Design goal:
Elements: E1 14-16, E2 23-25, H1 43-53, H2 63-67, H3 73-87, H4 93-96, H5 115-123, H6 130-148, H7 154-171
Antiparallel strand pairs: 1-2
Helix pairs in contact: 1-3, 3-5, 3-6, 3-7, 6-7
The structure holds zinc ion (3 copies).
One zinc ion binds at residues 17, 19-20, 22, 41-42, 44-45.
């Protein structure tokens, strides 16, 4: 197994996947690494299994259809993984914890949002459809863009949104288009 966390790339108290060589800090994995379970398989393995059990699940889909799906176990898992993939980028640090807004010439967003809050929302099963998760995720970046205006810091929002969007298309097998 790896000697660094797959998500944050740091050493520490790691839990090792029994079916691939990845390792995690307890709360870097999503969901948090489970108390018992020997063997244990990580979220990357669990996602791979879904794909292998139903190969047709990789045929192209329409986003509009994906968003209306109910958060049954498999969609719940996919959203957890997508969230994990965002945390895997180090630029996610800017969006992890609760922000605040005091900048000359700008007003804070009406509805602040941050990755840890989405993380709690997933854990507490507060989303009934994929749409709920995806709306909150996209809200994070949109609030950032709007607040930082012409400051070049706006680009961090663009960059992390691009990570989100690419992984969304991959994980939910969105039909490729130009
Ligand atoms: Zn970690
Ligand atoms: Zn694994
Ligand atoms: Zn089948």
């Amino acid at each position: 197994n790896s000697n660094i966390c797959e998500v944050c790339n740091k050493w520490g108290r790691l839990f090792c996947c029994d079916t691939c060589p990845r390792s995690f800090h307890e709360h870097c994995h999503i969901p948090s690494v489970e108390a018992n379970k020997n063997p244990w398989s990580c979220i990357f393995c669990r996602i791979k299994t879904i794909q292998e059990r139903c190969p047709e699940s990789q045929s192209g889909h329409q986003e509009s259809e994906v968003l209306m799906r109910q958060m049954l176990p498999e969609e719940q898992l996919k959203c957890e993984f997508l969230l994990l993939k965002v945390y895997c980028d180090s630029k996610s640090c800017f969006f992890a914890s609760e922000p605040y807004y005091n900048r000359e010439g700008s007003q804070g967003p009406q509805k602040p949002m941050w990755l840890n809050k989405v993380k709690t929302s997933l854990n507490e099963q507060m989303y009934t459809r994929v749409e709920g998760f995806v709306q909150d995720m996209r809200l994070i970046f949109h609030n950032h863009k709007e607040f930082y205006r012409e400051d070049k810091f706006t680009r961090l929002g663009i960059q992390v949104q691009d990570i989100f969007e690419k992984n969304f298309r991959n994980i939910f097998a969105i039909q490729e288009t130009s």
